[PDB]
C-alpha cells in the first residue's frame, strides 16, 4: 500500500481519462468547513477575552495558534445536519493535491462525474451533485445543487462555471450520449450543459423511490433504487422520453452496481449480499409511454412494478457490506 491523506470521508472519485488525475469528493456529517472552523475559532477567542484581561488576551492569542492535527486529535464534531465537503484533484502517481475546491458550510457532495458535452465538444467538465442542509434522521433537505466546473490545464484545475439548483439531493450523475443523466431524488433527468445553467431535456417521475446509482450501456440506463433494487430504462432518442421497461422482483437495499453485459447487472446491498440480475431472453426495450395517460390507467405493469421482470441468476451473502463492484 501507498497511502495519500484526505481531509473528509471520500464518497466517490472519477478518473479524468486524458491526464489520469483523480477527481475525489470528500464529505462528512457533524463537520465544519475550514472557513466555519476558523470563524468558530475567532469568536471563541473574542468570547475568551470578553469573559484578568491581559492574561485572557495571551490565552486567546495562544488558542488561535493552538492547531492540533485532526488526524490525531479528531476533527471537531459540529452539530446534527452540519456538513463539510471538498472536491480534490489529485495525481495518482504521488498524491499531490493539484486543486482543492471548498464548498459552502452544509453543502455535502454526494455525486461526481467527468464528461464532455456534445455542444462544447473537446472541453471537459466536472459535475458535482450537492445536498443543501441535509438532515439524515428524520430525513429532510433544503434541496440541492449541481456545480459545474470546466476541467482545464490538462485536467489539473477546476474552473467554476455555474451552480444549478435542484429540488432534492442529486444522488447520482452519469454521462449519457454527450449529455448528463442526473438522478434527483426519485426523478431521473437528462441535463444539457447550457451556458448559465444545466437544461432539463427529459425527466422520468416513475421511479418508485430515491435513486442511489446510475449505470448506462447504449440506450439502456440501469437505475439503482435505494430499496426497490434495479429499474431498466430506455432513452427514446427521437421521442425525447425515458421509459421504464423492466424491474426486479425483490426489494434490495442496493449500495453499488456493475454492468456485466448489455442484459446483466451485478449488484450489492446494505445487508452484505451480492446478486446478479439478468433480463430474460426476448425482453423488449422498445416500449412506449402513453401521451394521453392510457399506460398509467388501462395498460400497466405487473405486481405494481414494470410489465417485464429481471431474473435473479445469482445470490450470495458475502458476510460483509460491499460498496464497489468492477469487472476487470
Amino acid at each position: 500500500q501507498v497511502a495519500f491523506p484526505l481531509q473528509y470521508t471520500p464518497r466517490k472519485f472519477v478518473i479524468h481519462p486524458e491526464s489520469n488525475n483523480l477527481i475525489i469528493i470528500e464529505t462528512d456529517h457533524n463537520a465544519y468547513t475550514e472557513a466555519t472552523k476558523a470563524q468558530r475559532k475567532q469568536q471563541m477567542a473574542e468570547e475568551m477575552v470578553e469573559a484578568e484581561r491581559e492574561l485572557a488576551a495571551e490565552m486567546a492569542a495562544a488558542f488561535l495558534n493552538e492547531n492540533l492535527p485532526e488526524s490525531i486529535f479528531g476533527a471537531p464534531k459540529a452539530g446534527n445536519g452540519q456538513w463539510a465537503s471538498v472536491i480534490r484533484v489529485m495525481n495518482p502517481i504521488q498524491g499531490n493535491t493539484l486543486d482543492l475546491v471548498q464548498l459552502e458550510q452544509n453543502e455535502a457532495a454526494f455525486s461526481v462525474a467527468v464528461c464532455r458535452f456534445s455542444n462544447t465538444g473537446e472541453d471537459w467538465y466536472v459535475l458535482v451533485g450537492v445536498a443543501k442542509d441535509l438532515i439524515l434522521n428524520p430525513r429532510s433537505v433544503a434541496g440541492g445543487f449541481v456545480y459545474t466546473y470546466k476541467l482545464v490545464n490538462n485536467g489539473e484545475k477546476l474552473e467554476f462555471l455555474h451552480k444549478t439548483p435542484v429540488e432534492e439531493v442529486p444522488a447520482a450523475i452519469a454521462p449519457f450520449q454527450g449529455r448528463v443523466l442526473i438522478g434527483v431524488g426519485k426523478l431521473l433527468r437528462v441535463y444539457d450543459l447550457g451556458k448559465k445553467k444545466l437544461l432539463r431535456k427529459c425527466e422520468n417521475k416513475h421511479i418508485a423511490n430515491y435513486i442511489s446509482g446510475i449505470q448506462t450501456i447504449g440506450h439502456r440506463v440501469i437505475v439503482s433504487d435505494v430499496q426497490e433494487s434495479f429499474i431498466w430504462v430506455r432513452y427514446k432518442r427521437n421521442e425525447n422520453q425515458l421509459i421504464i421497461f423492466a424491474d426486479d422482483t425483490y426489494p434490495r437495499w442496493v449500495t453499488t452496481a456493475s454492468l456485466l453485459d448489455y442484459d446483466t447487472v451485478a449488484g450489492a446491498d446494505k445487508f452484505g449480499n451480492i446478486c446478479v440480475v439478468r433480463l430474460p431472453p426476448n425482453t423488449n426495450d422498445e416500449v412506449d409511454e402513453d401521451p394521453t395517460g392510457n399506460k398509467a390507467l388501462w395498460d400497466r405493469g405487473l405486481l405494481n412494478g414494470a410489465s417485464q421482470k429481471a431474473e435473479v441468476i445469482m445470490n450470495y451473502h458475502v458476510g460483509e457490506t460491499v460498496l464497489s463492484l468492477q469487472k476487470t
Binding site: 422482483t249 426489494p251 453485459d261 448489455y262 446478479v276 405486481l303
Partner: protein, 110 residues
Amino acid sequence: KKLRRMNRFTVAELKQLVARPDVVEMHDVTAQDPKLLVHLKATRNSVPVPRHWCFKRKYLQGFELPDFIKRYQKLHDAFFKWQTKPKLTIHGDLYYEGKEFIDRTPWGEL
C-alpha cells in the same frame, strides 16, 4: 356493539385518499386499518389474497407425459441431453378456478 362498524370511511373517501385507487375493493373499507391495507395492496412485488376467500363453495368443489420422456441411454438423455424447462408461472401468478380455460455476449457463460 355495531357502532364502530358505522365509524368507517366510505369507498369514495378511501378511493380519493390513496395513491392507487385501482387496488381499493368494496370490502377494504371494513378493515381495522384500511389505509395500511390499501398501502400493502399497492407494494411493488406483493401478491393478492386468493380470490375464493369469500366464495360460498370450498376451493375446488366447482396429465400428459412430458415430451422428452414420451420421446438405457435414451432414458439418461431424456434427463441429461434433451430436457426442456416447462412453462413456469412467474412470482405471484396464483392459480384460481378460471386460470386455465454494442456486443450482446453473455458474461460468465461456459
